[model samples]
Target: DQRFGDLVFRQLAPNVWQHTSYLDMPGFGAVASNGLIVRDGGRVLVVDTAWTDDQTAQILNWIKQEINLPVALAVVTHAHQDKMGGMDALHAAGIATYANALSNQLAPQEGMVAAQHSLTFAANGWVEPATAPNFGPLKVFYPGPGHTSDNITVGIDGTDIAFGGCLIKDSKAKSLGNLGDADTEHYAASARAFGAAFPKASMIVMSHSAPDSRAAITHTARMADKLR
Candidate 1:
């Protein structure tokens, strides 16, 4: 698999990486869901599986080929099908999963119907991964709906890099279709909330696009505030 930045053997850092899918492309704003691989000694964190189980499986295969470590944790950035449709696949591989508390309750509702269809179509024997205890150097919060009610942001400490998840985007970002699942106010507020929480961050890596900077987040916050 092709590597970017400091990525190697699917390891972005000594233990982190962006396990990419061949299906991933930024063409016409159709960026594939990105899964972050962070290995914390005994535990490895793989965040947000992509749209299809096949694609998800491909990602895992790539991970195994790159590093033989067992995945101890999985984080789903939101409730959208594209972000988490691969949960069952990861669970089958024996990794604990985490999501916004609200999304866990809401996932089985009609909003997750697409996943059910995918379970059959993708031939995945689906099972949800157990949510892990949330607390760490990375301060995370689900302030409220933006891209979707369960949309959330995940950040790392000290570094200028914060995974804005779906709340923010890169310079080449495209307008997302309204899913009627977002609360515009909260979504707008998120940019500011994340900015305030991670002020020194120079890079904002979105779940769907290239990494951005604090300036972009500030601009996004201003726009969000103006709309609010």
Candidate 2:
């Protein structure tokens, strides 16, 4: 049986996969929520968990049985339910999770599950919109306040892969989607800072739709500018 039920994953690269799951969001009816699985040699890292624990369980089972790789780490890209909702399952599976301290502090208040661990660069001082923390070959950073105060983006150092989380929007999106927790005033600046830093990124993954390349960041930045 397929561990992920109807959740389907598409390979964006030799060792990177992306999946989008459906959720009946309150005002949006059915919407898509995105997540990723990254193979790092004998171990793997999960970017974000789908909207439910069952879906997250499927991801975990698939990694253990199919890929045969132990999940080394899992990271919550933000404090929203669609992103951090599956932390419960990751925790149950004994998978260690890491998120920024700001996210860890806000998640519980937002009713989102918290990760088992935290990652921060506070000791080195704030690095403006974001901070680059090394995780194997991945360049992870918190891209300031955009979709949320603690939203972060992950980039594969030697590859064209970049996960923009909810801080970025898909190419076809006209609006910023949900701004309930967004800092619209600084959204463009934050995204621009990230985009400038990763201009060579050929692949950009967002939270709720199909993956796109650099164009996705450009399009999202424009939307943020208009909204600002």
Candidate 3:
């Protein structure tokens, strides 16, 4: 385990890691935010950035010093400050940052830097495989709007590992964290869709909690159901 100021990098699996950074939210105080660092051959893929450019710069520096792999690609999970707040850092490093087009659309509206590349998904489900090459082998799915309308779920190409942004709850989460932009009516529906989309995903990496098990899917669904 190594720390770059407030950002810490912890490997979760071969070629996969969890980088945690902190931010002071209005009600949550100094809340910890998580993102993924994926090694792709001689390059790297960052799922999300830290809370600020300075924090995200630590990740780039660590990757160069430790892994020695250039960050060829990155994907912002959402448009929130906790998610894509470091877009400037990644862009400054010349890394091609990607996100769902919808996320990009909402970023500027919220005063956040938008990702450079836009990964499109069908209105029905995931993106087309033909156009997925630029984003690597990972699969992206928009589970019909849960946490936010642009929230997405990402999975490694051939592994059961899944990246669940704020859209998926931590195993210990008793209630959905923030609902300011949540669609209560479709929250449960989206949660169940996420489970169905990744039935075999066991290593569920969430943005807040420790890496959870597949049971997190059921737990999240039940939590949303309770809203009914």
Candidate 4:
């Protein structure tokens, strides 16, 4: 059961698979995180990792054994433990990891591995449109600061699927789960920016819960609004 609980992969799109990884925190019990295993041709693009190296190894091994594709690239949404704790696993496996410049800078301080490639986003949060294939079909964007200074959102090109990471909340969440590094003043605005950027996002996948629709964006904005 432990092995089976390590990582669960589910097909959410024709070319995208969602890997749900678990971690049992001290006293807090077990928590789950969602990441992407997007395949294009013969390679896969990983979004985030599990809470530890061994758990992430499950994902890497699964990609090779199950998908029969090489893990080509990876992008961590932020520098938090749940999002990037498995950075070392990815690095040791020789996968090219990418993230926002801010996330890369902060990773080392948190004792996490910094991504090899640093992406620079515009002031308004434009990193690269999905139309460009620099990072495959994913449109990586930094929608201001919300969950953390380095939080980002990813959307697949030509599809309604959007991986919101921890920056966006799930529909059932009544409050922002963790705000230790939150931006109370701008979280709402940032969420609004995400909604504006991806109006067609119906299958919005967040980190901690089941995937929701575009309505989750509006719901997240409202929750963040309470912070102000």
Candidate 5:
């Protein structure tokens, strides 16, 4: 029935909603995925489409119940399958999409290792390659790579709220594992750029953690510095 399946929407900020997706896997049972939705005035933004076409549809349908502005934009923070898996479904619906330029630039003949992993997940309805993402003001900076070479933090400048994407992890996290796709050599540079660039942000939202204290940004930056 519903394509994208179901979503649990959490209002993380004034107009921003976090849609947590739950999937009943074959053997994994139920797993949850995190996707962010932002509402700016009359406009709406879907950050990181979920892992299934059904999940995408569910989110869109839910949004229709609340607002009718149409999903103005879809921002994929990185090239990973968990982030880009539902691109085709959104494209077929005519919604504009955005992501890091490097994702498309090197996606074709390069990133075979990442591609292979994405393809594997595709078989489970968790990955897809659709159109290219346009560039915009999503607080994305790629000075240093961490999760992936093309990763960027999506920020809401007006609210001073940043998606922080995956470039920076929660400092409270027990372990921070690099995907090896990022330019590890420059992770600190990226962190500094993020800190200096987003000085006005009072709240920092990351791809993996709950809305954290604005101090999380400084903590992440400090962690990056330690790695240096």
Candidate 6:
């Protein structure tokens, strides 16, 4: 068990790690916000961040000291604090951050800062509706709206690891956790689109839960059906 500050890192697969940082959530006491770290040789990419800047720094420091790899990029999945809260820290570390154009726009309204780099699927010549843009060996795709209007998924090319951010919930969740920025009407469609886009994914790393099998996708779909 590798621990840094209040963050714990667990290797879910070869070269892939699932980091959990605990945060106090009003009535929930303390909850874990999950993030992903993918190592490609000497380069590392982070998906999402811890609950705060301090925690983010601890995670990054752990990676630098333990893995001894350069933290190359950080991807923001939405405007939520648990996802993009550490953008300022990432910027301070001289790491380039990226997010969807919509996420970049909504972040300020959510009291969170947007990533330094904003990407657009259409402007980048990617066909609309779940198009996987070529960002080096990583595959980033927009699976429509669910948890938020701008949530996206990141996966390592040719691997089964997919960072579902907060859009995909744990298999144990009976109801959608937080709906403050959710589009319940279209959540099912979005989950279905994602499942179709990455049908072979073995591990779906969610924002606030442990990694689960493809059943997590099915769980989200079923939960979405109840909303309809």
The parts of candidate 6 lying over 4 Å away from their true place are 122-134
Number of the top-ranking candidate, with TM-score as the measure: 3
**Count of steric clashes across candidates, in order:** 2, 0, 0, 0, 7, 0
TM-score of 3: 0.94
Ranking by lDDT, best first? 3, 4, 6, 2, 5, 1
A best-first ranking of the candidates according to their TM-score comes to 3, 4, 6, 2, 1, 5
Off by over 4 Å in 2: 1-3, 122-134
Residue 200 miss distance in model 5 (angstroms):
1.3
Tens-digit lDDT string for candidate 5 (1-228): 122335677776677777766656677566555677777667678888776666777778878876667787787767765576677777777777666555655555442112212111122121233332232334444444655666666566567576666666565765444445756566767766666667787666666666676666666666666665
C-alpha lDDT of all candidate models, in order: 0.58, 0.79, 0.83, 0.83, 0.62, 0.81
What local lDDT score does residue 208 receive in model 3, on the 0 to 100 scale?
A: 79
Per-prediction TM-score: 0.75, 0.90, 0.94, 0.93, 0.74, 0.92
Query: Any runs in candidate 1 off by more than 4 Å, and if so which?
Result: 1-14, 20-30, 110-138, 172-179
> What would the per-residue lDDT of candidate 1 be over residues 44-82, giving only the tens digit for each residue?
566677666676666677667666777666667667666
| lDDT digits (tens) for residues 63-162 of candidate 6 | 9887888888887788888888888899899988888888889889888988877877753323243332324456777888898888888777667887
List clashing residue pairs in candidate 4: none
lDDT of 4: 0.83
Put down candidate 4 lDDT per residue, 1-228, tens digits, no spaces: 114445788878888878887778777678888888788777788999888888888888888776787788888999988888998899899898888888889998977888888888876787844322457677888888999989988888777788889988787787778788999999999988987777787898889877888778888999888899
Worst 10 residues of 1 by lDDT: 117-126
| lDDT against true structure, model 6 | 0.81
> Which lDDT tens digits does candidate 3 get at residues 1-228?
767777888888888888999998876798888888888787888888898999999988888887997888888888889899999989898988788888999999977998877878876778755545666757788888888888988888766688888878776788878778888889989988887887778888878777888777788888988776
Clashing pairs in 3: none
